[PDB]
Structures are given as C-alpha cells and as structure tokens.
Design a binder for this molecule. Sequence first.
Ligand SMILES: *[B]([O])([O])[C][N]C(=O)C1=C(O[C][C])[C]=[C]C2=C1[C]=[C][C]=[C]2
Ligand SMILES: [K+]
Length: 263
Amino acid sequence: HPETLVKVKDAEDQLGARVGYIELDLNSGKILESFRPEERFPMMSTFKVLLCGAVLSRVDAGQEQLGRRIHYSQNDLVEYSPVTEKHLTDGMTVRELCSAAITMSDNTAANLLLTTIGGPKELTAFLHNMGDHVTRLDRWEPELNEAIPNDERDTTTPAAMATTLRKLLTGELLTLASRQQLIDWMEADKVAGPLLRSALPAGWFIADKSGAGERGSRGIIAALGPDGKPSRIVVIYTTGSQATMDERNRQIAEIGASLIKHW
Ligand SMILES: *[B]([O])([O])[C][N]C(=O)C1=C(O[C][C])[C]=[C]C2=C1[C]=[C][C]=[C]2
Ligand SMILES: [K+]
C-alpha cells in the first residue's frame, strides 16, 4: 500500500538517512511495495538467518549434525556473546548455537557456526549457488557490522535479501524439517521486541531477525501474517543515521504499524 511508502519516506526524513524497504507476497513471490530495492545496505546480524540456512543445508546432506557439540574458549569470545559466554566449559551444540545466534543475536555463536561451514567465503558461495549473486559476507563478528559508507563488504539489497529469505523458507532448498527448524528459530526472540513485533497484534505470526551496526545501521527481515500464519516477507534496512537506537527502532516499528494498518 502506498501509505506504507509514505511512512518509509517519513522515516528517511526523521532519521536523516537512507531506508530500504520491500514487501513480498510469501505465497506467490510477487513484489507488493518497494523503496530503494536495489541499493546496498549492511546486513548486520540479519545474515545469521542465512548462516543457519547454510548450516541446515549441510545437515540435510548429512555433512553436519544439529546435536554435534562445539567446544570453544575465552579466546573465541567477541563483543556481545550473552549465551556463549555462559557455556564456555559446556560447549554448545550446533542446534543451540543457531538458537543463540537467531534468538539472542549472539555474535560468538555466529563465528563458531561460520567456522563450521567454511567461513564468509563459503556462505557467499552458498548464496551465489542458490541464485543470489548480490548478497555477500566478507568478514566475521564484530567487524562485519562496520557499515563503512560506500563499502560493499557484508552487504545485501532489500530485494536480494527478501527473495533469498523466501527461497530458504518456502523453496525446495531445505527439507521441510529444516525449513521449519529455521522458521522456529526465527519465531523465538529476546531482542527484536522494539521493531516489527511492537506493532504486531497478538494473534499474528512473525519469524524475524534484526540487525544493528555502526553509523546508525539498523534492520530487520521477517515473514509475518495474521492469525498465526505468515503470508508476506518484509525487509527493512537503514544506514547513516545519527539518531538514537530508540529513534531508529520507533521509525521501523512505525513502518510496521502502517504495513499492518493497510494489510
Ligand atoms: B547484530 O547486528 O545484531 C550484531 N550486532 C551487534 O553486535 C551490535 C548491537 O547489537 C548487540 C549488542 C548493537 C549496537 C552495535 C552492534 C555492532 C556494532 C556497533 C553497534
Ligand atoms: K527472531
């Protein structure tokens, strides 16, 4: 709905920065609304969903086991690792690491998982192989959140990310079991409350992943829909704002309220 673009444009005004937006029908894959669909933005933590997608793909092929335990040490701990810093002695299973990465956005968990699949190079190869030649991961946590202006490292476009998420969630790349496992991890959340979720009515379904980086970068990817069933994919990114985190959260949530209002 054009009224939603009014809100997206208002966000650019309020934040003094670029905002990328795309809304796709989950069933058909049809593009419903878009704003700067082909401009690059830092993915930030939203890449963690693509990461676990790749992990699940290996699980499907028998190259990995969700129950396999990964041991790590203090040397591996990077900034913001709420779950992993807690299990240094126990180690964590692949399944628990994807849960930590997606529900809490644990950064060390992402690095451990990246290692299991071959690193940023292999995640990019995975995406390229499935038809996405735009999205690219180049670095590890925490550097991949740098968001240097004009830098293409660790970026995607709203359009690239939206279609790739759609392929992972409803395409035939993953088995039904894995597709649901990925959706299940995205439905759980302890950090994206201020974003789309704050505008969502209680009965709605939402599977999402948020991201935050330097230079006011903020974003979220999600599959959502009324009455417990997702029916659309929404991707929103912004970078360059000097606004506070609460201000950025509010603008993204307002885009969500408009999306919901004109559903
Ligand atoms: B992901 O983008 O959520 C990983 N994000 C960060 O590490 C990060 C956060 O979120 C968790 C603390 C907030 C602010 C930041 C971050 C990274 C770089 C600069 C600012
Ligand atoms: K989530």
